Design a protein around this ligand. Sequence first.
Ligand SMILES: [Zn+2]
Ligand SMILES: [Zn+2]
Lengths: 212, 137
Amino acid sequence: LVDTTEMYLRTIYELEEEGVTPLRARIAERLEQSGPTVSQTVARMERDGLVVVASDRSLQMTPTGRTLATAVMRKHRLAERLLTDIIGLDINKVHDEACRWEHVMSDEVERRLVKVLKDVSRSPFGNPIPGLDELGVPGTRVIDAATSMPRKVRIVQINEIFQVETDQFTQLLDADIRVGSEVEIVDHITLSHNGKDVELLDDLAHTIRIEE
Amino acid sequence: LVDTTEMYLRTIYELEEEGVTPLRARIAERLEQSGPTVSQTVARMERDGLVVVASDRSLQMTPTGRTLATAVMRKHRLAERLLTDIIGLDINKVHDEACRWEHVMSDEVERRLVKVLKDVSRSPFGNPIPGLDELGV
Ligand SMILES: [Zn+2]
Ligand SMILES: [Zn+2]
């Protein structure tokens, strides 16, 4: 999304990366925003729990704020790879372009990019591309991945150890639906594999995870 | 840029493209935004000289508003081609993504896409890509 928060978080991330203290004046100067504007925005981020102002008044991203900053930097750099590797955009405009793009590019497009690009280790500007492992390039909860139209997915985990109800244990074994098995999912959530279809119960639907 | 103005202009273009009359109520419904909100935004657009509210309370885009409406549709359609032809994004997600990208793509990227893509005549959805001539490509 085209967030001011995302802009702020990625900026804190960038400074830290450069070995710079996430001081508010550095953020403002970097974002060209004024001191009062950054404080107004930082105070808003603290309430959303994405940042915290350290002792030295430097800004520390909470785990959530950091996960977000990382996604944004991932999309940013993945965008730059597309821009130079495929599109061929003037190298002097690739960064400024990607600054907008990091805000609109979806996770799905990032995975396609990771598959279609030759090397996604670094950005054209020599910086490592973060969050790839979180992008998935374990899984997503079947119930969350469950669309009203049948889609094929690869079983990531069944969380058998966390289940209280085990009635569906043999049912999945008969349907040959195991870890690594490419099985269809939909939205009750019925997983289909080996031709057979297992209509998951609430507990398994929430727990079983599948990648893409 | 991610303008609401751009969102309104591209929506009027779309309606026109369907042979539908750009009525404030149709824009409201297409954008989901409320009637007052549309009236409020259309008012601002008029003042910027991008649209005029015609006799039948239909919205006519000034030549300026139409140049922009078209540029946006062009980036939209050029984006969709990149997503389907190169990136290989799921066809069922191409439009919504392009709906975001149309606001951020630059004219330099479009010219590059025009050069790198095999056919920029239509979008993956059969609609003709407008403004190519004005892009200078
Ligand atoms: Zn960059
Ligand atoms: Zn579209």
